[PDB]
Amino acid sequence: LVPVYIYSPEYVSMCDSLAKIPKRASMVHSLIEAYALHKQMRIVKPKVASMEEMATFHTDAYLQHLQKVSQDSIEYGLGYDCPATEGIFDYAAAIGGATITAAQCLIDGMCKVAINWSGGWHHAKKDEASGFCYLNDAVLGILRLRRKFERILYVDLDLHHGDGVEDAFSFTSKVMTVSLHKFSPGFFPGTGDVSDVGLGKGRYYSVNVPIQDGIQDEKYYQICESVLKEVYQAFNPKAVVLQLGADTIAGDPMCSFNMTPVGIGKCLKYILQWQLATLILGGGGYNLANTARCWTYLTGVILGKTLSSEIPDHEFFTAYGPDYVLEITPSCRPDRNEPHRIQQILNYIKGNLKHVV
Ligand SMILES: CN(C)c1ccc(C(=O)NCCCCCCC(=O)NO)cc1
Ligand code: NA
Numbered sequence: 200l201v202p203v204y205i206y207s208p209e210y211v212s213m214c215d216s217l218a219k220i221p222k223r224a225s226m227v228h229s230l231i232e233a234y235a236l237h238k239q240m241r242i243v244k245p246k247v248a249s250m251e252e253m254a255t256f257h258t259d260a261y262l263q264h265l266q267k268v269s270q271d272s273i274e275y276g277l278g279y280d281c282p283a284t285e286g287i288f289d290y291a292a293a294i295g296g297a298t299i300t301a302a303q304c305l306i307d308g309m310c311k312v313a314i315n316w317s318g319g320w321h322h323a324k325k326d327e328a329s330g331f332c333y334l335n336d337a338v339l340g341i342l343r344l345r346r347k348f349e350r351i352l353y354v355d356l357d358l359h360h361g362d363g364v365e366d367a368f369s370f371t372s373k374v375m376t377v378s379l380h381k382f383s384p385g386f387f388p389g390t391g392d393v394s395d396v397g398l399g400k401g402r403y404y405s406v407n408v409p410i411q412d413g414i415q416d417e418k419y420y421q422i423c424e425s426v427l428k429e430v431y432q433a434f435n436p437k438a439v440v441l442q443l444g445a446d447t448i449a450g451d452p453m454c455s456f457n458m459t460p461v462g463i464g465k466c467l468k469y470i471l472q473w474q475l476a477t478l479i480l481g482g483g484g485y486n487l488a489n490t491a492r493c494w495t496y497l498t499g500v501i502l503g504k505t506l507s508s509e510i511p512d513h514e515f516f517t518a519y520g521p522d523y524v525l526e527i528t529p530s531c532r533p534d535r536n537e538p539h540r541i542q543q544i545l546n547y548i549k550g551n552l553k554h555v556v
């Protein structure tokens with residue numbers, strides 16, 4: 200009944216090759232390994248996603264294109280955010296396979312929790328790489344979980360709107376998506392206002408919480424709990440997919456939100472308490488050490504352990520300087536979230552939730 204840890208050196212190596220975030224998978228894994236948390240989980244080597252498996256969501260023209268490029272590209276969303284570099288198809292196939300493997304562990308009852316810290320690439324569209332995402336692994340995970348579990352809840356706590364996942368499932372009532380994100384014109388991807396609720400038979404089954412710069416642990420949790428509690432009771436999910444992108448975290452060069460891993464960990468504890476099949480994904484996170492600190496810490500809460508404050512010696516110890524501690528401060532900058540507007544967001548959501556289900 201011990202949590203599944205998707206991990207292999209091939210896999211971490213493949214994920215270290217993402218141009219946007221070099222060496223990040225290693226640092227995350229290395230910190231986890233340094234805390235010996237992998238000794239407390241069941242290490243599962245990820246499958247490589249076969250063509251037909253990624254075909255469950257991505258159109259075949261796209262998939263076949265990635266393959267050749269890996270060996271009109273502006274049409275398939277490739278370019279600046281998504282380079283056509285030697286091996287990107289193997290990259291996508293590894294990330295997608297990893298999330299699929301996590302979900303497959305879940306549906307097989309191998310574990311209550313399965314973790315793929317290298318996943319969470321929530322922007323990719325069916326025929327279109329986007330926002331560093333070549334392949335929407337969260338979508339393929341949800342789709343795999345759907346083979347056994349009737350209703351899936353996707354909760355996305357990344358800084359950016361989980362548009363690709365929302366889009367994938369916006370028409371159905373069987374998957375509800377809940378996104379907490381910066382919403383400010385010009386800030387990627389620009390979608391996901393509170394009024395975005397899903398479409399057709401999927402109407403009211405998309406939830407969006409547009410937040411502004413400076414949010415801290417206390418208030419983010421207040422909001423997240425308020426939305427989740429109402430979501431749980433109305434939707435009654437059978438399994439949960441949870442994206443925990445660390446770009447919300449104090450010290451991220453995106454410098455938008457002002458979270459510490461402790462406040463995100465509260466939200467996680469709240470989801471874990473539902474005691475449901477839960478697929479844990481990573482995502483954004485551009486301060487590499489802090490991201491490692493964050494997910495290592497969340498791995499701690501999954502296991503129900505509290506970790507030493509001192510960063511253990513390991514491959515990447517020097518990146519943790521000068522303090523070499525697990526915890527995060529809080530930059531001192533204003534909380535641009537007027538509590539009036541948060542209450543209008545919260546009400547509007549609760550109103551939408553009364554139509555579920
Ligand atoms: C300094 N530098 C080289 C860059 C700075 C910002 C971006 C960017 O935000 N691009 C837009 C795509 C943002 C999505 C990031 C993926 C994510 O975290 N999803 O949640 C790119 C490059
Ligand atoms: Na999000």
Ligand code: NA
Pocket residue numbers: 368369370371372373374375376397401404405
């Ligand atoms: Na939906």
Ligand SMILES: [Zn+2]
Pocket residue numbers: 357358359444446482483484
């Ligand atoms: Zn992000």
